[PDB]
From Swiss-Prot:
Gene3D superfamilies: Trypsin-like serine proteases (2.40.10.10)
Disulfide topology: C1-C114, C42-C58, C128-C182, C149-C163, C172-C201
Keywords: Digestion, Disulfide bond, Hydrolase, Protease, Secreted, Serine protease, Zymogen
Molecular function via GO: serine-type endopeptidase activity; serpin family protein binding
Species in which this protein is naturally found: Bos taurus (Bovine)
Protein name, entry field: Chymotrypsinogen A
Residue stretches making up the Peptidase S1 domain: 16-224
Phylogenetic lineage: Eukaryota, Metazoa, Chordata, Craniata, Vertebrata
InterPro entries: Peptidase_S1_PA, Peptidase_S1_PA_chymotrypsin, Peptidase_S1A, Trypsin_dom, TRYPSIN_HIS, TRYPSIN_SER
Propeptide: 14-15
Presence of the UniProt keyword Hydrolase in the record: yes
Top-level EC class as recorded in UniProt: hydrolase
Main location per the UniProt record: secreted
Assigned protein family: Belongs to the peptidase S1 family.
Active site residues according to the UniProt entry: H57, D94, S176
């Protein structure tokens, strides 16, 4: 997985501001999630032909459509897997999986990102990327210390939230359920599912995601069956 057919073109804008726009097929697992009337409110990542991982605040239901990639796949939901360490008062272990009713048809412009290991770590100063529509842009962002992070988001940083950005460039392109990815053994892997960011969308504040690695196994076990 994670070895995209058309390759992410990441420049300097990346680094900067509001960042930049990609090369289509670029972030191939990026999905949109449209509401019953083609209104998009969240989008998310594909790991397979059949599942999306996105956030649970996205609060996504079985009449939301997976929009992937019309060279597009609108993929309807079959069941929605939200999970119980789902706390909204906190928005933590903010993960939700989706079964689409009819497979994702793998091609150049649509594929799946890889999943990480639970043991894997991830490096603060490590250069990951937000894709989004919050045309679809790509921005680049280092993850940080949940204790650095702590100091930028108070009390709302627990076990499984993992923070990333605040380096002159901005969190916010990052729509919810959206993808925050890194490297391994050269695949991109989903590290962070987008939770939330700076209002004013300061380019000087860090952005906060959910941490896969802490939830992979739940993906893992949840997956598997259903």
């Amino acid at each position: 997985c994670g070895v995209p057919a058309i390759q992410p073109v990441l420049s300097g804008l990346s680094r900067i501001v509001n960042g930049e726009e990609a090369v289509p097929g670029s972030w191939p697992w990026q999905v949109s999630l449209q509401d019953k009337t083609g209104f998009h409110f969240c989008g998310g990542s594909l790991i397979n032909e059949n599942w999306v991982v996105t956030a649970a605040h996205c609060g996504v239901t079985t009449s939301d459509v997976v929009v992937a990639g019309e060279k597009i796949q609108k993929l309807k939901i079959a069941k929605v897997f939200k999970n119980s360490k789902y706390n909204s008062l906190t928005i933590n272990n903010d993960i939700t999986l989706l079964k689409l009713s009819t497979a994702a048809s793998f091609s150049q412009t649509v594929s799946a990102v890889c999943l990480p290991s639970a043991s894997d770590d991830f490096a603060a100063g490590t250069t990951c990327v937000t894709t989004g529509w919050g045309r679809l842009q790509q921005a680049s962002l280092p993850l940080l210390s949940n204790t650095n992070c702590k100091k930028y988001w108070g009390t709302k940083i627990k076990d499984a939230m993992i923070c990333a950005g605040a380096s002159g460039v901005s969190s916010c392109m990052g729509d919810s359920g959206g993808p925050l990815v890194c490297k391994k053994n050269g695949a991109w892997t989903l590290v962070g599912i987008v939770s939330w960011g700076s209002s004013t969308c300061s380019t000087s504040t860090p952005g906060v995601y959910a941490r896969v690695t802490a939830l992979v196994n739940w993906v893992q076990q949840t997956l598997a069956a259903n």
